[PDB]
């Protein structure tokens, strides 16, 4: 109403319009998904602006056969990620590091492993604060308003990611390329004109 | 049982067999969807019988570039929709008229804007009657029986529309063309023989 | 916990993790589906090992035009299913027999038709026993443990069948051929390498 006039509501703010809100755990899920989606969309966006490589084919740059092609990708970097001819980055090193670091972080967050700190943060609280609000924005501002803004950005980013998935399938081009083609000539470059062309299959 | 012996039941008539009936609003949704589906299937059907143009490609006839191709399509019409060479119908005129008329009707029905009449019709009642039963069939006949017949036609039309969607995807032909091909040789023209051919992709 | 430490639980054993357990009928459904899935996966598996013909195209061997190609397929058989040149098996005979036998069995199981026996077996009980446990394993062992093992095999076989569906769509080869290609070179033959190749469409 006042803070959420848009379609639907927030958990603790009313009744869901279509899919019933029956489990509180879903609330946590919705936030976690949302945070990842934000990092996803931004990432895809930024990377395509920096390298021209669409997000859905970037994985081919790093395989056990070769992962050196990513070494010089990052814009403005004072040096490549590894020297030329050193055979680095190595795919297995990247994979082992990701497994260890992200697995440990997720285990600490979800209660699989006991926390390394002794601050009493609660497992299952998607807004824990403390060390995870190091600049103290949640105590200097309005916590409930900030949570609503965060939830809205979560939902928007997830819907944008769904759009990215199906735009990739339907156009076989990057999302930034889709955006450029639309803004150049919106009447003649959109989903309906693409469908008239058969989406590349019909 | 007596009035609904077929699989399932109707809202207020028992328990849903598979997907639970939990919200009364879904009941309204089911009727509204259903009415559109009827107009949809009939439309596709009739248009393909009159013009030979399948429903899933008829949109390409009317674009901002050109919409005059629809002028002479309606069978038996004493004149085209607009004179030849006049540049009409115009896509923008069609779009604006649809937005105004259908938007106003939907707003009146859904309570977004107040009703233009003062008859006290209830917003949210999918069977309001009154001016929407001008011939008075609901009071001359059995209202509950007529509502059951309407609900059955709603469900049947919606399932037929789902069939139209997937038949279009699988055969790339109009639904009436599918019907003719099946009745001409049903053993050798059906979904299984189409699947053996790969649905045009395998 | 003790008997079901894996993710999730069993009906009567706790709360469903994601999709709520609200109807007891679904429990029966899950078992019946599961049993068919086992027979499915096994069947596909065994048939591909015996004939080399993938499960998703085996139907083309038997149509009203011709069903003699199946006569000599079964490995080690002392004779073909019918004499050569006899025009058998006939598709219509196979179809009629399947309809009569499987339809009668399903009607007896589901209470559509009254049971031919007078043993008092309960319709709706997916673990009836009696004549359906002729070797008496359910009373010689632990019934609850055996039911848990059966439920686990049900769920595993259903997930494997879902894998078979999408592997057929993505690779256009038999599931056993997929297994051989993966085990021969798992780093270079998997879903990611197939995706880099476009799944045959991109
Ligand atoms: C968040 C994780 C993550 C995601 C989403 C992707 C996604 C992708 N990678 Mg990448 N990767 C990820 C992590 C990583 N990748 C790689 C390394 C590679 C390589 C080397 C390659 C890829 C490739 C691909 C693409 C093709 C995959 C495919 O078959 O898509 C088909 C699948 C879909 C279209 C959607 C399927 C989703 C669905 C099955 C599950 C969704 C279910 C819901 C979660 C829940 C549903 C509800 C429940 C109740 C039923 C795809 C864009 C390939 C590529 O780029 O090819 C061009 C490729 O070659 N990746 C690494 C190692 C550093 C990762 C490590 O984190
Ligand atoms: C001389 C050094 C140097 C320079 C001039 C640039 C310049 C650029 N980089 Mg590159 N980079 C540099 C070194 C490096 N970059 C990266 C990694 C990246 C990434 C991941 C990205 C860029 C991007 C960009 C562009 C941002 C344009 C824009 O609109 O910014 C807008 C202005 C701002 C964002 C404000 C300026 C940022 C400033 C506050 C410093 C930020 C610090 C870091 C985030 C690290 C510290 C984090 C925490 C601890 C504080 C720009 C061309 C972006 C791009 O490609 O855009 C399309 C991008 O996404 N760079 C690495 C690591 C390999 C570098 C190391 O050598
Ligand atoms: C009810 C409205 C309506 C519908 C269903 C369609 C449908 C269609 N139009 Mg048409 N139009 C409609 C109104 C209008 N059209 C046009 C003008 C045009 C043009 C100019 C063109 C089309 C075209 C098309 C087709 C290709 C679109 C596409 O990308 O399909 C792909 C999408 C799908 C196959 C399915 C998508 C459904 C899914 C994404 C959402 C479903 C969600 C559920 C409703 C809810 C789910 C549950 C929740 C809880 C999650 C398609 C048959 C194009 C065409 O004919 O190409 C040959 C074309 O060029 N239309 C006008 C202007 C007069 C309309 C006016 O209202
Ligand atoms: C000389 C005039 C004239 C004639 C002879 C025809 C003849 C035909 N039109 Mg065509 N039309 C004519 C003028 C017009 N038509 C249309 C719009 C349509 C449409 C939208 C359709 C046809 C269809 C048909 C065919 C119906 C075949 C059938 O089985 O009907 C079955 C017999 C009946 C339905 C009963 C006879 C109808 C009768 C009750 C009059 C109907 C009145 C209107 C619905 C208006 C009612 C308004 C309300 C407020 C009372 C037939 C070839 C249909 C078609 O293509 O079929 C494949 C079709 O869907 N016509 C327009 C507007 C552009 C016309 C204006 O000039
Ligand atoms: C001389 C007779 C004869 C021989 C030597 C074989 C040999 C073979 N058959 Mg073939 N069959 C024979 C006659 C027949 N077969 C079949 C129908 C099948 C089928 C449906 C299948 C085979 C399969 C197999 C192979 C099993 C390999 C394995 O690892 O087994 C592992 C070892 C065992 C399973 C143990 C040995 C079985 C033993 C307990 C006897 C089973 C009796 C019967 C099931 C009938 C009795 C049922 C109830 C009452 C107990 C093997 C090459 C399988 C295949 O293709 O594998 C890839 C397969 O799925 N055969 C029919 C009916 C048309 C036959 C009749 O003439
Ligand atoms: C996985 C992500 C996710 C999750 C877990 C939730 C969870 C929740 N949402 Mg949220 N929501 C999401 C995404 C998600 N949402 C997105 C993307 C949007 C923007 C469109 C919204 C918009 C939204 C609104 C407006 C409202 C909620 C509400 C709710 C709550 C009740 C509904 C529920 O339990 O849904 C759980 C069920 C699901 C998440 C299943 C979603 C439906 C399926 C069919 C997915 C269909 C799309 C799928 C991605 C297709 C993939 C195809 C493939 C080929 C790629 C609950 C806390 C309501 C609320 O707060 O009530 C108090 C509410 O009013 N959500
Ligand atoms: C935040 C979400 C978001 C945004 C900003 C965009 C933006 C864009 N999309 Mg994308 N898209 C989205 C979600 C989004 N999409 C989703 C969820 C899907 C999956 C259905 C798609 C599928 C898709 C395809 C297949 C294509 C685009 C295309 C485009 C571009 C051209 C505009 C167009 O045709 O839009 C069309 C928008 C959609 C198909 C999404 C509609 C989602 C729901 C809300 C349907 C409602 C439609 C109805 C008329 C409005 C209801 C009233 C109210 C809710 C507003 C543009 C850059 C086209 C492109 O690349 O052109 C170059 C193109 O071909 N999008
Ligand atoms: C969107 C249309 C729609 C809606 C809103 C409803 C709503 C309802 N139906 Mg109805 N129904 C529909 C279509 C619809 N039905 C169709 C097409 C049929 C014919 C097959 C039926 C047959 C039917 C029966 C037999 C019964 C009901 C019942 C019910 C009620 C309880 C179930 C429920 O809440 O479902 C709401 C949930 C949904 C509408 C989601 C549907 C499932 C999803 C996964 C969609 C799957 C198909 C999808 C279109 C695929 C798209 C693919 C894409 C690529 C194009 C409720 C009032 C029961 C009742 O009256 O109980 C008292 C009952 O017994 N319905
Ligand atoms: C049709 C098969 C089926 C059925 C009827 C059930 C039914 C049940 N399961 Mg079981 N389950 C299944 C398959 C099935 N399961 C599979 C394959 C697995 C292994 C992954 C499991 C794993 C599992 C666990 C771990 C648990 C359950 C639980 C439950 C219970 C609560 C959930 C519920 O009601 O779901 C009914 C709703 C559905 C079956 C819909 C499923 C979701 C849809 C969207 C389908 C998505 C995939 C689909 C096939 C895509 C097709 C694409 C097409 C192009 C081919 C209920 C008795 C819970 C329980 O026992 O709680 C006490 C529980 O903890 N199940
Ligand atoms: C719920 C509900 C309630 C109401 O009552 C009604 C209604 C509103 C209808 C409904 C709404 C129903 C509904 C639910 C829903 C869910 C969606 C879309 C969820 C999407 C999650 C997306 C995530 C986590 C994305 C993560 C991306 C990463 C990690 C990317 C990472 C890389 O991309 C990077 C950065 C670079 C690449 O190169 C490499 C990779 C790929 C790794 O969508 C919906 O519509």
Please provide a written account of the structure.
Chains A, B, C: Chlorophyll b 1 binds at residues 35, 121. Chains A, B, C: The light-harvesting complex (LHC) functions as a light receptor, it captures and delivers excitation energy to photosystems with which it is closely associated. Chains A, B, C: This is Chlorophyll a-b binding protein, chloroplastic. Chains A, B, C: InterPro entries: Chloro_AB-bd_pln, Chloroa_b-bind. Chains A, B, C: One of its GO terms (biological process) is photosynthesis, light harvesting. Three copies of one chain form a homotrimer. Chain A is mostly helical. Chain A has a single domain (24-196), classed as Chlorophyll a-b binding protein (Orthogonal Bundle), CATH 1.10.3460.10. Chain A is 48% helix and 0% strand. Chain A has six helices and no strands. Chain A has helices spanning 24-51, 91-110, 137-140, 143-171, 175-184, 191-196. In chain A, helix 1 packs across helix 4 (143-171). The longest helix of chain A is centred in the last third of the chain and has 29 residues, at 143-171. The termini of chain A are far apart. The interface between A and B is small, with 6 and 7 residues. The site of one chlorophyll A has 16 residues of chain A, from helix 4, helix 5 and helix 6.
């Amino acid at each position: 109403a006042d803070i959420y006039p848009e379609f639907g509501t927030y958990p603790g703010g009313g009744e869901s319009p279509i899919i019933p809100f029956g489990s509180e755990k879903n609330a946590e899920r919705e936030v976690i998904h949302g945070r990842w989606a934000m990092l996803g969309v931004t990432g895809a966006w930024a990377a395509e602006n920096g390298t021209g490589i669409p997000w859905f084919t970037a994985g081919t740059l790093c395989t056990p056969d070769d992962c050196t092609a990513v070494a010089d990708k990052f814009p403005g970097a004072v040096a490549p990620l590894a020297p030329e001819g050193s055979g680095y980055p190595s795919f297995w090193n990247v994979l082992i590091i990701e497994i260890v670091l992200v697995g440990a972080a997720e285990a600490y967050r979800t209660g699989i492993s006991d926390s390394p700190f002794d601050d009493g943060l609660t497992v299952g609280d998607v807004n824990p604060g403390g060390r995870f609000d190091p600049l103290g924005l949640a105590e200097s501002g309005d916590l409930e308003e900030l949570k609503i803004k965060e939830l809205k950005h979560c939902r928007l980013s997830m819907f944008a990611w769904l759009g990215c998935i199906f735009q990739a399938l339907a156009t076989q081009e990057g999302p930034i390329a889709n955006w450029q083609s639309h803004v150049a000539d919106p009447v003649h470059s959109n989903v309906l004109t693409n469908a008239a062309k058969g989406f590349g299959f019909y």
